[PDB]
Amino acid sequence: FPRVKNWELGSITYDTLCAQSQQDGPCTPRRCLGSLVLPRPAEQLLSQARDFINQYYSSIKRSGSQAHEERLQEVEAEVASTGTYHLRESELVFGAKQAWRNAPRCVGRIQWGKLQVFDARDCSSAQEMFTYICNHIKYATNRGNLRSAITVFPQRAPGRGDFRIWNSQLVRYAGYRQQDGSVRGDPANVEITELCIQHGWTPGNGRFDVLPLLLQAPDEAPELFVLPPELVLEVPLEHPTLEWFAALGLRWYALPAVSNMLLEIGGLEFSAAPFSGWYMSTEIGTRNLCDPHRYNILEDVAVCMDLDTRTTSSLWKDKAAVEINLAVLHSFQLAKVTIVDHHAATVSFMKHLDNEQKARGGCPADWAWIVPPISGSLTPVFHQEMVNYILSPAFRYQPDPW
Amino acid sequence: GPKFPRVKNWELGSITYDTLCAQSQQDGPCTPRRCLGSLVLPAEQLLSQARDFINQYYSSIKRSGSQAHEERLQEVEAEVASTGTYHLRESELVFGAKQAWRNAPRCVGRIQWGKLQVFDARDCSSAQEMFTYICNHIKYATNRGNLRSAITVFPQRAPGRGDFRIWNSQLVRYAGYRQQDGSVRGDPANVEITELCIQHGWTPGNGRFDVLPLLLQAPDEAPELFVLPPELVLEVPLEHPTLEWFAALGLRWYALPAVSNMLLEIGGLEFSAAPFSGWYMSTEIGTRNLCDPHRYNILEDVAVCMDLDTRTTSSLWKDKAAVEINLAVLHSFQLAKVTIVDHHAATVSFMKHLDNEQKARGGCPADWAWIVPPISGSLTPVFHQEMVNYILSPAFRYQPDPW
Numbered sequence: 001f002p003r004v005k006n007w008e009l010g011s012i013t014y015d016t017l018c019a020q021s022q023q024d025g026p027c028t029p030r031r032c033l034g035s036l037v038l039p040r041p042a043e044q045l046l047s048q049a050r051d052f053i054n055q056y057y058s059s060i061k062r063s064g065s066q067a068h069e070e071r072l073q074e075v076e077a078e079v080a081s082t083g084t085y086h087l088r089e090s091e092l093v094f095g096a097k098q099a100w101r102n103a104p105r106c107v108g109r110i111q112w113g114k115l116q117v118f119d120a121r122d123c124s125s126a127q128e129m130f131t132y133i134c135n136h137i138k139y140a141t142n143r144g145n146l147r148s149a150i151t152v153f154p155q156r157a158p159g160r161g162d163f164r165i166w167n168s169q170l171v172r173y174a175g176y177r178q179q180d181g182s183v184r185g186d187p188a189n190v191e192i193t194e195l196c197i198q199h200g201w202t203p204g205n206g207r208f209d210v211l212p213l214l215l216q217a218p219d220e221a222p223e224l225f226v227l228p229p230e231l232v233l234e235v236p237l238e239h240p241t242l243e244w245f246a247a248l249g250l251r252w253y254a255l256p257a258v259s260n261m262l263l264e265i266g267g268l269e270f271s272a273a274p275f276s277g278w279y280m281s282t283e284i285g286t287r288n289l290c291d292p293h294r295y296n297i298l299e300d301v302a303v304c305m306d307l308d309t310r311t312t313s314s315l316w317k318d319k320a321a322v323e324i325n326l327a328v329l330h331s332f333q334l335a336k337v338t339i340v341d342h343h344a345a346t347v348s349f350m351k352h353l354d355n356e357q358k359a360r361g362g363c364p365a366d367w368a369w370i371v372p373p374i375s376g377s378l379t380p381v382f383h384q385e386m387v388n389y390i391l392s393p394a395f396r397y398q399p400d401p402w
Numbered sequence: 403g404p405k406f407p408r409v410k411n412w413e414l415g416s417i418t419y420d421t422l423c424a425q426s427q428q429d430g431p432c433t434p435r436r437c438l439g440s441l442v443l444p445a446e447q448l449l450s451q452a453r454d455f456i457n458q459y460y461s462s463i464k465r466s467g468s469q470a471h472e473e474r475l476q477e478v479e480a481e482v483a484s485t486g487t488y489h490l491r492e493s494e495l496v497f498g499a500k501q502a503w504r505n506a507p508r509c510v511g512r513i514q515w516g517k518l519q520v521f522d523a524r525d526c527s528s529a530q531e532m533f534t535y536i537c538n539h540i541k542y543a544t545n546r547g548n549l550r551s552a553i554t555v556f557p558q559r560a561p562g563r564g565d566f567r568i569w570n571s572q573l574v575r576y577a578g579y580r581q582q583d584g585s586v587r588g589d590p591a592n593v594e595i596t597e598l599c600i601q602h603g604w605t606p607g608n609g610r611f612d613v614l615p616l617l618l619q620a621p622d623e624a625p626e627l628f629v630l631p632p633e634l635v636l637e638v639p640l641e642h643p644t645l646e647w648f649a650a651l652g653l654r655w656y657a658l659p660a661v662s663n664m665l666l667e668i669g670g671l672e673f674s675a676a677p678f679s680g681w682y683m684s685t686e687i688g689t690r691n692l693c694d695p696h697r698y699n700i701l702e703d704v705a706v707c708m709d710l711d712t713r714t715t716s717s718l719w720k721d722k723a724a725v726e727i728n729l730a731v732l733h734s735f736q737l738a739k740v741t742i743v744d745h746h747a748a749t750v751s752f753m754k755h756l757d758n759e760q761k762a763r764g765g766c767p768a769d770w771a772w773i774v775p776p777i778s779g780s781l782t783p784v785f786h787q788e789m790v791n792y793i794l795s796p797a798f799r800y801q802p803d804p805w
């Protein structure tokens with residue numbers, strides 16, 4: 001059991017929760033691979049299913065009861081005959097919150113118990129997927145007052161193709177490759193933009209064109225659906241003191257909704273299970289707008305600020321980055337859309353660690369992802385040691401469908 | 403593909419494989435069950451370590467398999483066979499010291515690894531001589547502000563005999579005085595060593611920036627106290643380029659970062675006292691030393707001077723003050739003509755180092771959480787670079803405090 005120290009305060013805990021991990025990560029005693037973004041039978045499903053049902057009845061303080069025993073028998077009966085089984089809705093709700101709770105790269109986990117779960121397992125077409133996706137967006141957005149949500153489409157089955165959302169997020173901006181090899185719009189979405197085009201989309205030519213959805217029912221070609229512009233809440237970016245900033249024409253969408261991850265609960269796998277909460281300002285202000293392989297606006301802003309771009313030592317990059325993050329915070333706050341800054345978020349994450357220590361004896365956490373991309377050591381999480389491991393229920397990466 | 407870790411740069415889309423990790427002979431704290439990467443601290447044996455190091459040396463001069471290589475090997479085992487230890491040739495020490503710096507996963511300054519002035523102090527026999535050696539190191543390394551990387555190597559651990567030790571964690575640190583109030587005047591990181599200095603007869607000051615004396619230990623003796631002559635300790639008064647009041651804060655830092663309590667291991671030999679130094683990266687002073695809550699903690703003071711709204715997180719008052727403090731550090735060192743490197747130039751040059759080592763050794767052990775600077779992380783190229791972390795020898799290691 002690893003000793004875990006906070007270096008700001010000198011306090012120590014022991015992670016005992018990590019002993020519950022059944023799935024290996026990428027590190028060995030010879031070498032740490034913790035900085036890598038991606039990872040390089042009835043008997044098995046049955047034991048994962050049992051473990052998960054044990055978790056569910058333990059959660060509701062009914063561990064060992066009749067309802068518990070008879071549910072374990074239902075699952076056993078179903079697997080033995082069909083090679084698979086099905087979750088009850090309450091179990092799925094428990095499973096979804098648990099997967100979020102268990103996500104080591106998520107800093108917003110203090111919110112984990114507050115999650116609206118939409119059961120969409122009765123979906124038989126891409127068209128119906130779209131309807132469900134539209135309700136989710138309407139619900140989650142809630143006129144700027146964002147509410148965390150997940151919609152769960154039908155689980156994977158051995159004899160057939162997956163339900164999939166091809167887009168990585170429900171709302172994302174197009175990336176158009178230009179003749180001069182440069183990208184107009186968001187360079188992270190060139191490929192998906194190109195797919196939307198080969199499947200019949202009439203593309204715009206702006207910097208912030210909301211992409212259509214490519215939704216796929218089993219063993220069918222994906223289908224194209226345009227989101228009604230009134231469902232996609234956006235925030236124009238202005239700066240509190242710098243009046244020229246708004247003339248940059250910059251904007252971002254309100255709703256961060258991840259749509260291409262796989263949700264695993266009790267050995268069952270949900271290949272389409274889009275989920276959303278609200279932004280932490282550094283995601284937009286630092287990563288989306290300042291990454292050199294994204295909108296890459298740092299120099300433009302610095303020049304507008306009349307900073308000296310000749311040399312690194314003037315810290316023109318740091319200065320511009322702070323104003324961009326400020327603009328995001330201010331703009332969202334002006335537009336009455338839920339946003340959280342990296343100080344507020346990391347402070348609440350520290351509380352989460354304390355809560356989880358008492359409740360479960362630990363919390364899986366990925367330090368490199370929890371610590372924000374500006375002002376790292378200015379946040380309490382920088383000084384907190386963390387233990388990273390895989391618990392189930394879990395969110396996972398899966399291959400792109402194309 | 404290749405059965406070696408695949409390493410991706412996400413800014414550029416480039417891929418490499420680390421083959422160098424195969425050479426690792428020591429385990430870190432990670433397992434397949436759990437990653438512990440964020441933890442700050444996690445005769446037959448000697449001979450195999452020695453043989454490996456000697457093989458390393460002869461490969462580095464391209465004489466692997468040669469008569470001289472096999473003779474040295476035979477010479478090493480004969481020394482161990484009769485004495486339980488062996489000794490390094492002068493040039494072997496030089497190579498091993500540079501290699502230990504090259505191998506250090508947490509150092510971003512490694513582009514400079516081949517430019518290291520190695521002082522051989524393996525003749526040192528008293529605390530007074532240790533002092534002389536250290537003063538010469540400080541004088542050479544400081545070079546009136548044109549800093550030069552250096553290491554001074556004192557005698558190795560002997561069986562049955564006591565260690566040479568510098569009790570201080572650095573050759574230059576500021577005192578931390580615990581107050582009746584409960585608070586600390588000076589550097590709170592240095593409370594214990596300050597209190598040890600007073601116990602061993604140092605008459606303390608009562609300032610925020612009092613240079614500590616050295617507590618130096620020759621084998622099997624109590625440590626002796628030595629005051630550095632102040633003309634040897636170059637310091638930089640901090641001022642800001644445009645914020646005129648910053649100078650009035652009376653902030654300052656010393657020029658020479660010199661780690662003094664680390665163990666240098668080479669071929670199984672352990673050098674308990676081998677202090678080394680380079681020059682600062684500006685974030686070390688401006689962000690950590692000055693803005694950590696458990697250090698000088700000046701963020702609020704500076705933000706108040708800048709008239710920021712310190713009552714709400716979303717004003718980004720902390721981010722704004724930190725940037726200016728960091729700029730003040732850079733500006734002040736540049737004005738004073740003291741070598742310093744900003745976090746952008748340092749990480750850019752570290753990326754070049756990664757490419758050099760890919761070609762030369764097939765990888766570079768690097769600790770991502772330490773390589774990425776404490777401000778402006780994703781603004782530097784290293785944030786977007788995946789890294790493989792593992793232990794290679796020769797190495798620098800932490801060692802227990804002597805008291």
Ligand code: HEM
Pocket residue numbers: 096100103105106107108109111115148149150275276277278279280283340345369395
């Ligand atoms: C409620 C507000 C939330 C905030 C402020 C938040 C914040 C974040 C941040 C900053 C990251 C790091 C990802 C990055 O920067 O690229 C992250 C990752 C993640 N979040 Fe949260 N999150 C929230 C809600 C949720 C919800 C509702 C779920 C699912 C039910 C969730 C699941 C995840 C998962 C699985 C990851 C890891 C994805 C990956 O490995 O890229 N989060 N979150």
Ligand code: HEM
Pocket residue numbers: 499503506508509510511512514518551552553661678679680681682683686743748772798
């Ligand atoms: C030449 C200029 C140098 C720069 C800019 C530099 C920079 C750094 C930085 C930023 C760190 C991270 C440590 C922290 O933030 O606490 C570090 C660690 C380290 N450096 Fe370098 N360094 C330099 C020279 C050297 C030299 C000459 C050596 C030894 C020969 C060395 C060996 C190490 C070691 C062993 C560590 C990890 C131990 C620790 O501090 O925890 N460095 N360095």
Ligand SMILES: Cc1cc(N)nc(C[C@H]2CNC[C@@H]2NCCNCCc2cccc(F)c2)c1
Pocket residue numbers: 037038256257258275276277278279280283
């Ligand atoms: C639900 C929720 C709320 C908030 N605020 N935030 C989040 C994280 C997502 C949004 N903002 C970034 C992050 N996830 C998007 C990218 N992450 C996958 C990394 C990856 C993997 C493979 C290939 C790639 F190109 C990239 C989720």
Ligand SMILES: Cc1cc(N)nc(C[C@H]2CNC[C@@H]2NCCNCCc2cccc(F)c2)c1
Pocket residue numbers: 442443511659660661678679680681682683686
């Ligand atoms: C040679 C050289 C040049 C430069 N620029 N920089 C350096 C690193 C030192 C200077 N600035 C901090 C760092 N040395 C910090 C001490 N080691 C790790 C932290 C630690 C470990 C154990 C207990 C603790 F309380 C703290 C060396």
Ligand SMILES: C[C@H](O)[C@H](O)[C@H]1CNc2nc(N)[nH]c(=O)c2N1
Pocket residue numbers: 035036037368369370412785786787788789
């Ligand atoms: C290579 C490195 O692991 C990668 O750039 C990670 C680092 N930390 C991160 N942290 C968060 N929150 N989001 C990210 O996309 C990343 N990227």
Ligand SMILES: C[C@H](O)[C@H](O)[C@H]1CNc2nc(N)[nH]c(=O)c2N1
Pocket residue numbers: 007382383384385386440441442771772773
């Ligand atoms: C808890 C965490 O491991 C610790 O605070 C580390 C993080 N990264 C660091 N990186 C550097 N360069 N120096 C440090 O002291 C630290 N501290």
Ligand SMILES: [Zn+2]
Pocket residue numbers: 027031032033034432436437438439
């Ligand atoms: Zn690891």
